[PDB]
Amino acid sequence: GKLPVPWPTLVTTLVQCFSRYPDHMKRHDFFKSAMPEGYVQERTISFKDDGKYKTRAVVKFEGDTLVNRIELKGTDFKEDGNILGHKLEYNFNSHNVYITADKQKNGIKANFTVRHNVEDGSVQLADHYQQNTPIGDGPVLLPDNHYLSTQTVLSKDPNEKRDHMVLLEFVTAAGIHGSASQGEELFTGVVPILVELDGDVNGHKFSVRGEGEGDATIGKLTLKFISTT
Numbered sequence: 001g002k003l004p005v006p007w008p009t010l011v012t013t014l015v016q017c018f019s020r021y022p023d024h025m026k027r028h029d030f031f032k033s034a035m036p037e038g039y040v041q042e043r044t045i046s047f048k049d050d051g052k053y054k055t056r057a058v059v060k061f062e063g064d065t066l067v068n069r070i071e072l073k074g075t076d077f078k079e080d081g082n083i084l085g086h087k088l089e090y091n092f093n094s095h096n097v098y099i100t101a102d103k104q105k106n107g108i109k110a111n112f113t114v115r116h117n118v119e120d121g122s123v124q125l126a127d128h129y130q131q132n133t134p135i136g137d138g139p140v141l142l143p144d145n146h147y148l149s150t151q152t153v154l155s156k157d158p159n160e161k162r163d164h165m166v167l168l169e170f171v172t173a174a175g176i177h178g179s180a181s182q183g184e185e186l187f188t189g190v191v192p193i194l195v196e197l198d199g200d201v202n203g204h205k206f207s208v209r210g211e212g213e214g215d216a217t218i219g220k221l222t223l224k225f226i227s228t229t
Helices: 023-028 183-187
Strands: 039-047 052-062 065-075 096-102 107-117 123-134 146-155 164-174 191-201 204-215 220-227
Touching: 023 164, 096 123, 191 220
Parallel strands: 065 191
Antiparallel strands: 039 052, 039 123, 052 065, 096 107, 096 146, 107 123, 146 164, 164 220, 191 204, 204 220
C-alpha cells in the first residue's frame, strides 16, 4: 500500500557502480572494482528540522543481476513535517556526490546534501553521510577526491495500480585530464538490477522492490519500484 514517506526521499537509498567514469578517471572507480563480491554501503541521512534515516545495504552480483538489498531505519520524524506529511514534490534535483578515499577501511566516504522541493516553494534538505567498504579480500581501486554528478526524472506507469515510482537516472564522474579493474568488465553491457528495501520510519513499516537495468557505459539507470507493503 501507500508508502509512509515520499518516494523522492528514498531515491538515494534505492547502485553507484552504474556511474559513468570517463576513460581518464577509470582508476578512480571503487564501486565497480569491488564486484562481484560487492560492498556494504551505509548512510545517515539527516532531514534538516526533521528526522533521520540510517541505512545499510549490501550491493553485489547474484549471477547476472546486480542486487541492492537495504535495511532502512527512520527515527525522530515530525508528524506534520515534510516527510510524514507528504509535502514533497515528485521530482529530483541534480546533485554532486563528493567522494574521498577511506584508506583505513579500504573503501570510500561520500558527503552531499539533497534538496527536496516542497509543495509550498520551500526546500527540505537531506544531508547525506556515506561510507562504503568492500566485502571481498581482493584489491580495490581507492580514488583521488572527485564527485558524481546526477540527473534524475521521476514518472508513473499509467497501468500500475500499486504505489510505485518509475525512475530514469544518469550519473557521470568528474572533478579530476584498457580496464582498470576486473570488476569494471562486469559492467560493459546492459546489466539487470534488483533492489529490495525493508523500511521502518517512526514505526511505519514498508518494503520496496525495484527491477530494471543499468548501462554504466552511459551512466544510465532505468528502474520501476513498487511498494510491496
